[PDB]
Design a protein around this ligand. Structure first.
Ligand SMILES: OC[C@@H](O)[C@H](O)[C@@H](O)CO
Ligand SMILES: OC[C@@H](O)[C@H](O)[C@@H](O)CO
Ligand SMILES: OC[C@@H](O)[C@H](O)[C@@H](O)CO
Ligand SMILES: OC[C@@H](O)[C@H](O)[C@@H](O)CO
Ligand SMILES: [Mg+2]
Ligand SMILES: [Mg+2]
Ligand SMILES: [Mg+2]
Ligand SMILES: [Mg+2]
Ligand SMILES: [Mg+2]
Ligand SMILES: [Mg+2]
Ligand SMILES: [Mg+2]
Ligand SMILES: [Mg+2]
Ligand SMILES: [Mg+2]
Ligand SMILES: [Mg+2]
Ligand SMILES: [Mg+2]
Ligand SMILES: [Mg+2]
Lengths: 385, 385, 385, 385
């Protein structure tokens, strides 16, 4: 289960670089130089890194400081062969964004958020990114009167439409990926799930430029089934990027390493990504727990990739097992994939087998055989066949 | 706070008619004749009722039995002046639907579910319904291998497209409203939230024929903000119907009377419906607790309407209060409603006030004044001004 | 991973006998004769069964009917070698218990609940049960005024004290195990967690007669860590029985087969039970999904036991691995098990190494090495070492 | 609804002093001098303040710095008439406590945590505190192997027993209050609920010295009913202190002002505290949202007290209303408060009215009338009678 760059594993600078500050806690680790993170991730077999603007260039940097930060980062990428497939904007840390970036009540803040984003889109393209993520973590409210959501969605659409006009104006090939989250740091965040983000994208002027960046733990913060949401995003043609981590159900955003949290959901996720032929980065947005020193940071990052590769092997073995293939037919997964009425509406209306002569009791008596199928899946996951 | 039919309050037959069977419990009330429910609801000031096919006509009825059930119901509606604005299909109780109706793995069950629906669309139109709800409560899974969600969504789209072809073929004006729910009775249900349903509708052949029927408690079963989801549905033009009830957060579907559960969410919901000018039925999908006798059933139904009317008065008083109007300006709700960049992309890029000369610290220091605004809202809700 | 009776696996009659009725659904399976369940469970390698009074003898049975039901059951136990280690009372299905059994507001119902329990304690002892479970699933409320919880706890203590007086009066060796659950079917249930039940037991007249019967899914319905709660029950000496199943987080009570739901929690549970030398029944309180026919019922029951045995092997291998033993020392699990201050309070107060000369920064810099330890645990669970 | 010091409202220095740092965000407010907080809270009508050691004296202060911080604070208390009824230790912010204080795996950290606590107990007594709170926010784990919970509970008991020996040795009257929380900042926290803490206290050497400090939002983070948990703590005689705030269900710890979050739960809480004659501080452990400037901080603090006083008036009016008193009798709340079997076990066994001649159907048919009672409660809360 040794990863290599060909596995397309990527990490945010802010993941392994997390210093361990939490609601209640000061830093437990010193800051990491992005150059060191690139070198250490490459040695573990990562393919690339990703960044927020303010992870790569300290907020408030001069043009000479900005050029030197980017030069040193480019040298680390060149020294390692690491790529930068995705970048994003920090529209959440600075107190100016306390009520939002693109949906701040203050119009001057909304305009600044757009200019900050556009500046970093240019840098992302220079570093070779194909995807630009937007996580509107400050978009939302703690109280009902504070935010008129229809007005906020109008502002959010304006912002994304302006960004689409910008990349079209520059001839850039980059596409956007909107990252849902239901809550935290706002009491409720706008576009709280994959579904809400998919729905929103359909109302943008150029919907083809936008997809989703779903994160395992975010959908699980609403108690939702992450593989099901990924399936809907794939069905819509909108899975442009993905964030992999672990979460234990409905609680604060834990950002555990991938494979931790809901292990069986991780198995079904990998099964789906691999079955569907998802071709994008396998990006980890996780935080090594603050209990860890730097050795533990690199162990946690290595574990992300290891767990993906174990689950990939087990899912592939499940799907290739003739006994599983027989169980899938016994459970009518083949019939689920066949059109209900390719004969057409009139033929269905005229088919007595579909109503007048349908033996509902005989159909009801047919077991689905799902428990045997699921225990084959469990046996494959655990290596107990 | 006395309701009259002009308030457009509606109830499902299955609400006040719930006999009190639960996971763990036998019935605590005798069955109600739909005629008696129509009479009792009319006396409380309801505007109308709604039905599943199998609430009005027992499953398996002969044509003569069906005609007599409908005749008696029509007489009760005529005697009271009650309307039938919405109807729906039961695709969940009979064991044949144990793996779904429109997304059952068994193709013969999917065809039967469509024929059962189409038969009841014809009856709904005869009784004057404008909306046909679909709650796919059996669509989903308890295990990962049992249901390929992309295939299931293909089947769900086929089904809704065939229903749209049917009502277009008959020249009916009825529209569809898809009701999301995240789980229960399936471990995970497909289209689990308002957002997922809105997203799905955009991929139907005739999206204009379909909207959502969100239910208070269903979105709250995922920990989501129900008023925010309603705002997104209104923003999309898709709030075709609504189900009102109460829920205490993330747990089984409680179906408490409206106003119970999350009271402040109920206040902000009513504020939004009324502000937006929502014109559809205020439908209650609730269950009088099984602790209650029939007197308690009618008290619980009356309480649904009373609570709506109290909250309507308090929300209107909040929005009309000059002190609240001043607080809304202090919190920049006026500025949230103004375009970010009607001057256009190039003007924004050339505006030094938006980046080079934006004083981020001065903007960050400006408080939002949201707590004062929210305490005015609390004082209005409680009648403590 | 083949179970035998020596593994002490037990099942409730109501588990494999569940006919599949849910909030929203009619039965999908015919009723099972308890004799057939005993025979089929024995063939799978179960050690025994458990029962509610009303699972073994239909409610309202005559004395001659009761004797014949018990005779046939005793013959099945004799034919198979199956045991009956635990029994319980149904104080939840009949509508008389709609507001509770022992804490019903109606005093005549509370007295009846006690007489119903006492009658079944006598039968449990005749069939050889060592444990008598009490799940107060109707004890609680949907509204705040309905139930004064201090008064209800006074009634609950009276009831348990009377039951303790009864078994002491008869010279029975049976002990009680209180089963917590946070909600469902009541909006909130009294004694909602392991902790609340443990706390309550300490206020009973004869606390030694009472322990807990925790259920995996019940603690997970409150988002709690089931292994941690089991550890507290073991620390208190009160783990008298356990109910094993699966649950996906905070939602309705799913009662999935054991190993389903939170797989890693199942691993840590088995690790703890086995490490601690828990000697009681490994009882499954689960429901084969209603999608299944009888073949699927027996497959789901077999899977409960298989999954326990797989996890037992992997947990034992984890704890016996020298590399894990080294990682445990690196993470200071040895030091967690050593007294903080066996030198005594005065010695601690006089120890400059504990305050004046404690190098907080050196201590803070020491990583815990928990991620490496947890990835060893993951590798052992998955058979990926 | 104007508070005065006679209402016993208290606030932590860290509440109104919260600078607004969150997972994802830098400070939005400057630090407050404790002297200014004491003055501003007094002007709002607060009775007193509370502190962690490190809120009053910066961590690492010299003895001369410590004396000056305490002198200035004492002068502010003297200038205002404010009291200090409770104090606590910060065993969570400094990185040394990353794996716990009293249950850290490192024994030297456990000894330091005890010395840090003991030093602040002495200061708390000097400032007149009656209660010493312990919130073990770092006690717990993110992974299963990291923490053996039985060993951790042994360490936690040693720590609390040593603290009890210390205050007994000094002749102090102060008592301890253990504050449960289910998670955050640890993935799971030990003693996660009121029940678990109550259970633990019964195993301490001197249980009379220890009670609970429950917090509204903490129990609601597990989806539990906070008034029910308070009722159990009152039933046990262990409600030594309480933390009041608001929370929207199962998510990160929001610390909203009291009355926000679950409004009806706030009503039933106040009803219970007032009915029971709870005599301790009404302490607010809340965070003014980071959206707010200092004017908003003081508005949010004022709102805490206002909301308590509104709910106190409405709860008192509910209980005093003759129509409510009649509804309570109709719902048999009087009968809930009467012993089940003061006639004794033998009399119950010999009472045919309790079994052989109990008419279960007549009892089952009697409605509980809980919905009418709850709508009277709603009408009282909303001022809609
Ligand atoms: O909850 C935090 C989010 O996951 C971010 O890390 C985004 O992925 C990018 O800003
Ligand atoms: O959870 C149950 C659903 O709310 C239904 O009552 C639908 O509204 C219509 O089938
Ligand atoms: O939630 C249901 C409970 O688990 C019961 O099955 C008990 O174990 C015994 O009545
Ligand atoms: O979740 C944080 C806790 O509520 C603390 O504020 C305690 O009350 C005292 O340390
Ligand atoms: Mg997970
Ligand atoms: Mg996250
Ligand atoms: Mg992310
Ligand atoms: Mg609600
Ligand atoms: Mg519902
Ligand atoms: Mg509904
Ligand atoms: Mg589980
Ligand atoms: Mg259960
Ligand atoms: Mg159980
Ligand atoms: Mg609250
Ligand atoms: Mg808190
Ligand atoms: Mg607190």
């Amino acid at each position: 289960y040794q990863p290599t760059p060909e596995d397309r594993f990527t990490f945010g600078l802010w993941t392994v670089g997390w210093q361990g500050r939490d609601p209640f806690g000061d830093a437990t680790r010193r800051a990491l130089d992005p150059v060191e993170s690139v070198r250490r991730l490459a040695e573990l077999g990562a393919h690339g890194v990703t960044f927020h603007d303010d992870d790569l260039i300290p907020f408030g940097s001069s043009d000479s400081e900005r050029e030197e930060h980017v030069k040193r980062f480019r040298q680390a990428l060149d020294d390692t062969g690491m790529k930068v497939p995705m970048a994003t904007t920090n529209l959440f840390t600075h107190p100016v964004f306390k009520d939002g970036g693109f949906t701040a009540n203050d119009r001057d803040v909304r305009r600044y958020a757009l200019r900050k984003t556009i500046r970093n889109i240019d840098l992302a393209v220079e570093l070779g990114a194909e995807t630009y993520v937007a996580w509107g973590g400050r978009e939302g409210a703690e109280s009902g009167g504070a935010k008129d959501v229809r007005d906020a969605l109008d502002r959010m659409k304006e912002a994304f439409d302006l960004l689409g006009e910008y990349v079209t104006s520059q001839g850039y090939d980059i596409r956007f990926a909107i990252e849902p989250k239901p809550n935290e740091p706002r009491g409720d965040i706008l576009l709280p799930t994959v579904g809400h983000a998919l729905a929103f994208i359909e109302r943008l002027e150029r919907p083809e430029l936008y997809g989703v960046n779903p994160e395992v733990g975010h959908e699980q913060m609403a108690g939702l089934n992450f593989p099901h949401g990924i399936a809907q995003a794939l069905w819509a043609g909108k899975l442009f990027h993905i964030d992999l981590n672990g979460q234990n159900g409905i609680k604060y955003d834990q950002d555990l390493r991938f494979g931790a949290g809901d292990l069986r959901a991780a198995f079904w996720l990998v099964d789906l990504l691999e079955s569907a032929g998802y071709s994008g980065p396998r990006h980890f947005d996780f935080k090594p727990p603050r209990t860890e020193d730097f050795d533990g940071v690199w162990a946690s990052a290595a574990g992300c990739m290891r767990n993906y590769l174990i689950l990939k092997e087990r899912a592939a073995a499940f799907r290739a097992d003739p006994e599983v293939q027989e169980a899938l037919r016994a459970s009518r997964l083949d019939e689920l994939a066949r059109p209900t009425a390719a004969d057409g509406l009139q033929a269905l209306l005229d088919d007595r087998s579909a109503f007048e002569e349908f033996d509902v009791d005989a159909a009801a008596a047919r077991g689905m055989a799902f428990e045997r199928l699921d225990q084959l899946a469990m046996d494959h996951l655990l290596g107990a066949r």
